Amino acid sequence: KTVVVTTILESPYVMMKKNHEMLEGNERYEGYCVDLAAEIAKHCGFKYKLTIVGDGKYGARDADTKIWNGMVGELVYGKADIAIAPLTITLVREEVIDFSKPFMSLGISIMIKKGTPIESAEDLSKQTEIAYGTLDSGSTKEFFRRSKIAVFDKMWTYMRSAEPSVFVRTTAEGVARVRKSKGKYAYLLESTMNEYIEQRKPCDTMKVGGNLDSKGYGIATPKGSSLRNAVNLAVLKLNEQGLLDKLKNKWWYDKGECG
Amino acid sequence: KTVVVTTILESPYVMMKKNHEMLEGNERYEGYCVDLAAEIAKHCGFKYKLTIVGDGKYGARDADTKIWNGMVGELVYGKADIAIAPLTITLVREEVIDFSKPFMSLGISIMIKKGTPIESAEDLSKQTEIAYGTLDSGSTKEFFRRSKIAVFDKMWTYMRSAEPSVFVRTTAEGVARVRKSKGKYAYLLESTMNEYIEQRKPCDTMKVGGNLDSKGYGIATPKGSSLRNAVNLAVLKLNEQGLLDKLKNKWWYDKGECG
Numbered sequence: 001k002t003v004v005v006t007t008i009l010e011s012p013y014v015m016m017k018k019n020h021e022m023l024e025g026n027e028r029y030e031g032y033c034v035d036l037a038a039e040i041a042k043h044c045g046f047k048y049k050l051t052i053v054g055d056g057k058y059g060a061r062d063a064d065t066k067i068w069n070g071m072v073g074e075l076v077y078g079k080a081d082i083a084i085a086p087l088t089i090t091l092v093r094e095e096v097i098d099f100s101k102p103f104m105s106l107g108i109s110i111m112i113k114k115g116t117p118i119e120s121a122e123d124l125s126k127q128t129e130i131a132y133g134t135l136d137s138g139s140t141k142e143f144f145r146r147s148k149i150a151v152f153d154k155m156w157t158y159m160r161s162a163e164p165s166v167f168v169r170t171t172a173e174g175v176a177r178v179r180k181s182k183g184k185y186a187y188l189l190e191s192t193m194n195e196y197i198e199q200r201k202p203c204d205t206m207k208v209g210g211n212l213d214s215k216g217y218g219i220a221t222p223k224g225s226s227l228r229n230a231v232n233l234a235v236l237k238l239n240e241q242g243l244l245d246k247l248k249n250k251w252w253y254d255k256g257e258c259g
Numbered sequence: 260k261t262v263v264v265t266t267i268l269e270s271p272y273v274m275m276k277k278n279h280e281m282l283e284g285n286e287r288y289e290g291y292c293v294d295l296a297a298e299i300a301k302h303c304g305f306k307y308k309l310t311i312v313g314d315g316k317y318g319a320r321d322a323d324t325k326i327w328n329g330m331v332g333e334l335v336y337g338k339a340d341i342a343i344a345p346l347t348i349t350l351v352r353e354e355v356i357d358f359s360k361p362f363m364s365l366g367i368s369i370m371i372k373k374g375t376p377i378e379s380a381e382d383l384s385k386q387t388e389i390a391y392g393t394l395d396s397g398s399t400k401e402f403f404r405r406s407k408i409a410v411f412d413k414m415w416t417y418m419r420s421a422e423p424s425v426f427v428r429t430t431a432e433g434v435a436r437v438r439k440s441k442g443k444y445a446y447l448l449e450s451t452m453n454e455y456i457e458q459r460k461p462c463d464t465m466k467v468g469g470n471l472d473s474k475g476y477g478i479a480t481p482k483g484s485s486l487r488n489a490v491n492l493a494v495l496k497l498n499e500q501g502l503l504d505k506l507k508n509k510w511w512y513d514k515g516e517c518g
């Protein structure tokens with residue numbers, strides 16, 4: 001039967017094509033995870049329907065209702081058969097679904113406006129001219145809250161107390177604050193998105209320094225899924241064939257706007 | 260029985276309190292519609308639980324499955340008893356749920372970066388230096404697509420074909436696009452949100468021109484609800500008591516940042 005694929009509208013993983021209103025089904029979409037889904041489906045021998053997650057979320061368990069939201073919720077409640085998306089591999093998610101081996105690495109990184117005299121996390125931690133922050137309710141904030149590393153502890157102590165708030169509700173808001181004329185703000189976010197935005201007009205931001213942690217994105221299936229093993233082996237095959245590296249280069253660089 | 264209220268996290272209608280993690284139940288939330296819900300419940304004599312709509316949407320019928328999403332779907336399918344939110348009164352919605360009389364007026368409006376030489380839709384339509392657009396899916400786009408008014412037809416013809424795309428996925432994206440544009444992008448959106456953002460730091464956007472249409476937000480109940488009549492009379496009583504105007508002033512202006 002037709003496999004229901006849950007995914008999320010996040011660039012460049014899944015984007016609406018030019019002329020999407022004239023198109024139907026899977027042809028409406030393009031991007032890294034659209035290309036990845038087509039290859040996974042070929043290698044595993046299934047036909048599929050791409051669906052955009054109903055709530056636009058990745059997946060977390062509400063502490064009060066005990067209900068999972070996002071793509072993880074769609075898998076655990078039987079709304080979708082597989083999630084093919086930049087879904088971070090985490091312990092609480094692996095307790096309720098199965099992840100493939102990762103298809104992409106990422107880590108916390110620093111975004112500056114070009115010109116800002118900052119090249120690293122240590123640089124941020126040792127000055128006060130440039131403000132810095134992150135999403136108000138996510139994994140980057142939690143990384144800093146829990147860290148026992150001196151540099152990151154110093155950064156957290158600053159961020160938690162800073163006035164006005166250095167936290168933002170969205171990346172659109174965070175990047176707008178980086179870009180504001182004489183804004184003197186740096187934004188902490190996933191390296192993959194920082195690198196992506198660095199390749200988009202107006203070409204005024206950059207990723208600086210090394211990543212602060214190491215994580216991976218994986219494909220997720222529900223417990224006991226007949227697809228688990230084949231999907232896992234397919235991710236490894238695509239890596240060994242060089243296809244994952246080719247797709248990253250395609251969507252970040254070949255289609256990049258900053259030279 | 261405890262009435263289940265569906266609502267949506269949209270500022271300043273319903274927002275998480277700063278200290279929401281320390282709070283429980285209805286006390287976690289604040290905003291115009293939180294104040295409205297408390298007064299409607301008092302007038303109608305019910306106890307209630309505020310819930311945030313699972314999919315984060317207002318309500319539309321999928322053209323293929325024919326299934327309603329959002330708060331409208333929660334009412335239609337029996338998941339909530341009442342929706343107390345900035346839910347626009349429309350024909351297709353009124354066919355499937357009942358709306359109260361409106362509690363607030365709105366219409367499509369133009370957001371500019373301060374200093375942009377635009378005072379009206381006609382001004383936008385007669386030039387090309389300043390790009391303009393709206394949400395990629397929604398009622399504003401549909402208004403333009405369907406209009407027979409010469410100015411609005413001219414605007415639609417431009418927007419539908421503009422490259423790069425003038426459409427955005429979210430208002431956070433639209434507002435950020437206005438803010439970095441040096442005035443070369445204007446964003447079309449509901450007047451109530453445009454007015455709200457004009458009162459938020461960094462105080463660099465303005466609402467300009469008259470509204471392009473006239474609509475209202477209403478409280479919605481499923482067909483056959485025993486609450487319909489009382490909710491409707493309550494909305495009228497609150498208006499006659501001055502409370503609706505008092506709440507709009509409280510949440511838009513008393514709590515504004517640009518005065």
Ligand SMILES: O=c1[nH]c2cc(C(F)(F)F)c(N3CCOCC3)cc2n(CP(=O)(O)O)c1=O
Binds near residue numbers: 058086088140190192
């Ligand atoms: O599984 C997850 N995958 C995620 C993938 C991405 C992206 F980079 F776009 F791929 C992001 N971006 C963060 C930067 O702004 C744009 C959204 C967030 C993700 N989150 C929430 P977080 O871990 O709180 O950041 C997850 O949970």
Ligand SMILES: O=c1[nH]c2cc(C(F)(F)F)c(N3CCOCC3)cc2n(CP(=O)(O)O)c1=O
Binds near residue numbers: 398399430448451
């Ligand atoms: O019932 C509806 N009520 C809505 C109320 C609001 C708000 F202004 F926040 F109150 C908005 N905003 C549009 C501007 O960006 C933020 C969200 C959208 C609404 N939509 C979707 P639309 O009609 O496609 O715009 C509805 O359907």
Ligand SMILES: CC(C)(C)c1ccc(C2=CC=CN3CCS(=O)(=O)N=C23)cc1
Binds near residue numbers: 363
């Ligand atoms: C008193 C308040 C609450 C300010 C109000 C809000 C909206 C309207 C309204 C005007 C014209 C057309 N329509 C379309 C049907 S509507 O959405 O029910 N309302 C209107 C009138 C008064």
Ligand SMILES: [Zn+2]
Binds near residue numbers: 024
């Ligand atoms: Zn067709």
Ligand SMILES: [Zn+2]
Binds near residue numbers: 063
């Ligand atoms: Zn909850």
Ligand SMILES: [Zn+2]
Binds near residue numbers: 136137275279280
């Ligand atoms: Zn919070």
Ligand SMILES: [Zn+2]
Binds near residue numbers: 302
């Ligand atoms: Zn009253």
Ligand SMILES: [Zn+2]
Binds near residue numbers: 020395426
């Ligand atoms: Zn589009």
